[PDB]
Amino acid sequence: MDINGGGATLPQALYQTSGVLTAGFAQYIGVGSGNGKAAFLNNDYTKFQAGVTNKNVHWAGSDSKLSATELSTYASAKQPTWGKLIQVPSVGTSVAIPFNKSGSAAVDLSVQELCGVFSGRINTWDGISGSGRTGPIVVVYRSESSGTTELFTRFLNAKCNAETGNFAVTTTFGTSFSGGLPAGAVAATGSQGVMTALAAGDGRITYMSPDFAAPTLAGLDDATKVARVGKNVATNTQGVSPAAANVSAAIGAVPVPAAADRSNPDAWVPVFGPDNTAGVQPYPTSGYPILGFTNLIFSQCYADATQTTQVRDFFTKHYGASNNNDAAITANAFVPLPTAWKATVRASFLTASNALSIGNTNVCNGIGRPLLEAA
């Protein structure tokens, strides 16, 4: 009986790369982070494959953090019989700004121009300085509950302080800005659905997984297709591309989860946010500024011993010092976790005597998510 996972589309091509998921894992199903969280929290396989009810959900990918209400409801309804859930970073990622507007001139957005495009204040390509382009801008956004939206709106919430309204951190972009969507904005579903829409009319722009924002990695550096971010005309400063190399230093500087807080799944997922605000990492001053983590959601405990071993073997690979997934992570435009982060994940969720360890024979005694499905 295979282990079934799915959720976030931002990293789906990573999890679909041969060998990244280990023995016993079904191929990953990309449906969006909101759907992934709901699939795991409710053990609802229909959130992965509509109309299919004869399988359990074992894990999810999400770039949206579990909310207080999600965590509390799982703790009271499911944890007594299934064990604690585990929420852990998988990889670091940039958020790219692909667009469909031809021209040899590089498109390099200042942060305030980015803010104005996504608030609707700036609605013509003229209004992007130095763009070489004219005509209307059409914003494409995610229709559904999206972790890419959450990562992106964290940045807008932190930086966009000069609009007629404010951006809230959310998974649903259509309600993020208090002044509404830009006129003419187009909704689409999934990372790939957004990229298809980007191409379906001229002058379109969006926010996107770096693994989908260009067909090839080098394409993240083509500023005729993927905007640079960080222009400052007055100081004569160029913005840079969302290539993984331009976020990797900032990802590597993020502190490991605080030791005393490790039983709280919320403590494991770092978030970027406003400056001089404890509990959130400030966005980096150098390199590419829009970044965050995409995460995995598992159970500590599975009633079946084989499924338990299979899950542990995946963690051994994904968080291993050797024989790990880091090459595939880079190939998919993402940032590996550093040694100290991997070691911290292993110490809590693999090392057998830890109270948090997957399959712990004491903590998981008699408990765990079920082998058979029942309705």
User: Can you give the CATH number for the domain in which 308 is found?
Assistant: 3.40.190.10
- The pair of three-digit structure tokens given for residue 352, joined into one six-digit string: 């057998």
Whether 52 contacts 31, CB under 8 Å: no
| Cα–Cα dist 372/351, whole Å | 28
| Cα–Cα dist 110/117, whole Å | 11
The string of DSSP codes covering 289-316 is --EEEEEEEEES-BSSHHHHHHHHHHHH
| Cα–Cα dist 129/345, whole Å | 44
Q: Are residues 349 and 270 in the same domain?
A: yes
Q: Which secondary-structure segment (H or E) carries 108?
A: strand 108-109
Resolution reading in Å: 0.9
The experimental method is X-ray
Q: Are residues 206 and 257 in the same domain?
A: no
- The pair of three-digit structure tokens given for residue 140, joined into one six-digit string: 């494409």
| Cα–Cα dist 316/56, whole Å | 23
Q: Are residues 275 and 204 in the same domain?
A: no
Burial class (CB in 10 A: 0-12, 13-18, 19+), 278: exposed
Q: Are residues 238 and 127 in the same domain?
A: yes
Q: Are residues 198 and 312 in the same domain?
A: no
Contacts of 67 (CB under 8 A, 6+ apart): none
Domain end point (choices 211, 243, 275): 243
Whether 175 contacts 299, CB under 8 Å: no
| Cα–Cα dist 32/145, whole Å | 7
Contacts of 151 (CB under 8 A, 6+ apart): 63, 93, 95, 290, 291, 292
Whether 310 contacts 23, CB under 8 Å: yes
Q: Are strands 228-229 and 108-109 parallel, antiparallel or unpaired?
A: parallel
Beta bridge partners of 186: 140
Domain containing residue 149: 95-243
3 state SS of 54: coil
| Cα–Cα dist 48/316, whole Å | 25
Q: Are residues 18 and 129 in the same domain?
A: no
Domain end point (choices 213, 243, 273): 243
- The pair of three-digit structure tokens given for residue 321, joined into one six-digit string: 């010092």
Segment 1-4 long-range contacts (CB within 8 Å, at least 24 positions apart): 1/304, 1/307, 1/371, 2/26, 2/55, 3/58, 3/59, 3/307, 3/310, 3/311, 4/29, 4/45, 4/48, 4/55, 4/56, 4/57, 4/58, 4/59
Q: What is the DSSP letter of 105?
A: S
| Cα–Cα dist 307/240, whole Å | 44
Indicate the angle between helix axes 147-159 and 111-119, nearest 10 degrees: 120
> For the chain, how many helices (H) and strands (E)?
11, 13
Q: Are residues 128 and 118 in the same domain?
A: yes
Number of independent structural domains in the chain: 2
Q: Are residues 88 and 114 in the same domain?
A: no
Q: Which amino acid is residue 173, in one-letter code?
A: F
Contacts of 259 (CB under 8 A, 6+ apart): none
Domain end point (choices 216, 243, 270): 243
Q: Which secondary-structure segment (H or E) carries 250?
A: helix 248-252
Q: Are residues 250 and 164 in the same domain?
A: no
Q: Are residues 152 and 238 in the same domain?
A: yes
Please count the other Cβ atoms lying within 10 Å of the Cβ belonging to residue 166.
Answer: 14
Q: Are residues 118 and 230 in the same domain?
A: yes
Burial class (CB in 10 A: 0-12, 13-18, 19+), 361: exposed
Q: Are residues 237 and 111 in the same domain?
A: yes
Backbone angles phi, psi at 196, to 5 degrees: -65, -45
The string of DSSP codes covering 110-121 is -HHHHHHHHHTS
